[PDB]
Ligand SMILES: *SCCNC(=O)C(C)(C)Oc1ccc(Cl)cc1
Ligand SMILES: *SCCNC(=O)C(C)(C)Oc1ccc(Cl)cc1
């Protein structure tokens with residue numbers, strides 16, 4: 001790895017600088033190097049990893065949707081043949097996206113998840129595993145599509161099972177996991193009723209727990225609760 | 237070149253798709269491949285080239301300014317030593333920026349400018365040559381800094397001389413050249429009076445020529461005139 | 473698109 | 478920063 005010669009602490013420092021400069025590809029490469037040092041990550045370092053790759057893959061997803069839209073229009077009735085270029089370039093972006101997803105899933109498998117014993121780390125990594133299989137599912141069309149979807153579901157489910165046993169209902173990681181698994185149900189699994197039920201039950205159980213929280217914890221939890229209610233508003 | 241096997245027309249088509257997807261690094265690589273086919277560029281193709289690299293280098297410049305700011309703060313009195321990391325990462329971004337500038341200047345020299353005989357193409361390319369030497373000047377600190385600045389000045393001046401002889405005062409390329417040469421004077425050459433005089437004379441001479449224009453040409457010219465007046469407002 | 477974090 | 482095109 002090109003970051004093998006750089007100190008772990010220097011990689012973390014430069015990831016933070018890259019975030020300040022909105023250089024998310026750099027930030028992801030620095031965090032990849034930090035993970036590959038083989039030590040467990042702290043809470044803050046897990047955030048740096050997830051922010052970096054979320055921004056990289058988010059950009060790729062946005063681009064892929066633009067191109068897929070153009071490609072679909074090109075294949076409608078009455079559209080003038082434009083050649084293979086739209087498909088080729090959509091495929092190029094798609095392959096790069098899959099590569100990023102495979103890289104993140106690789107870090108989780110080698111060896112972040114197997115060393116993550118605390119709920120706060122293990123749930124976070126399993127949620128990420130669900131997220132990056134979900135991104136693969138968004139572009140999947142082949143023999144393995146159902147297996148990709150089930151890989152996302154399995155990771156999310158394991159994360160949910162732990163989060164319900166080991167975290168309070170207002171824990172922001174528990175809330176964010178439920179937010180994203182709900183979107184998985186709605187957008188990937190064709191299960192809108194399950195998406196809505198999960199978002200609503202998650203919201204209501206968090207509401208009932210807010211009274212236990214400090215002002216700062218309250219702010220953190222209500223932020224994610226508002227995203228649950230935003231999705232519910234979109235869907236109902 | 238990695239784009240050597242792709243048709244010129246397919247490269248242009250994919251540059252346009254990349255722009256729609258806001259994938260400017262891709263757009264620049266596609267246009268680089270199109271230029272390297274060795275044929276002259278049309279007006280629209282010159283715009284695709286300039287948009288692609290302007291967006292790429294613009295992002296690098298923004299990042300470099302963030303990092304340089306952090307680096308300067310780190311070197312002030314009372315600041316805690318943080319090690320070489322800020323400088324290293326600023327240098328990394330700076331080297332990548334210089335690489336992009338060298339690539340664009342390379343395309344202009346090999347062989348876009350020498351084949352550009354019409355004012356609309358030649359002024360456009362010489363303006364670009366001034367722009368990319370200006371970006372190099374923004375980060376220059378070595379023995380060749382004054383020569384980099386003078387390279388920018390020389391290119392801008394040749395473009396100005398042609399534009400004044402061969403283009404009307406409202407021509408958007410003439411206006412944009414004057415806008416950017418004015419910024420060169422203000423920000424690079426430490427010549428604010430020349431920057432202000434050029435912007436004002438350019439604005440006034442365009443104003444007097446607007447009566448000759450159609451509605452659509454009027455819109456194009458007044459757009460760039462407003463940028464001249466915005467800069468004048470900043471500077472006075 | 474729906475919100476995810 | 479000033480405007481350029
Ligand atoms: S870990 C990145 C820092 N956190 C965030 O940006 C927000 C979205 C405010 O909080 C969460 C992010 C991710 C999860 Cl799983 C939960 C909350
Ligand atoms: S060539 C890119 C298309 N044109 C533009 O985006 C604007 C800024 C509207 O016009 C000009 C760009 C560049 C020049 Cl030199 C002049 C006008």
Ligand SMILES: CCOc1cccc2sc(C(=N)N)cc12
Nearest residue numbers: 016019042043044045047048051
């Ligand atoms: C979890 C440990 O620290 C965080 C708590 C809450 C929000 C953020 S944002 C962030 C970052 N570099 N983007 C880190 C954190």
Ligand SMILES: CCOc1cccc2sc(C(=N)N)cc12
Nearest residue numbers: 252255278279280281283284287
């Ligand atoms: C010059 C030939 O065509 C243009 C005139 C005016 C504005 C634009 S913008 C643009 C583009 N792909 N960004 C091309 C043009």
Ligand SMILES: [Mg+2]
Nearest residue numbers: 006007008009
């Ligand atoms: Mg070490």
Ligand SMILES: [Mg+2]
Nearest residue numbers: 091094095139
């Ligand atoms: Mg594919």
Ligand SMILES: [Mg+2]
Nearest residue numbers: 194197198201
């Ligand atoms: Mg249930």
Ligand SMILES: [Mg+2]
Nearest residue numbers: 242243244245
């Ligand atoms: Mg050919």
Ligand SMILES: [Mg+2]
Nearest residue numbers: 327330331375
């Ligand atoms: Mg340097």
Ligand SMILES: [Mg+2]
Nearest residue numbers: 430433434437
């Ligand atoms: Mg003069």
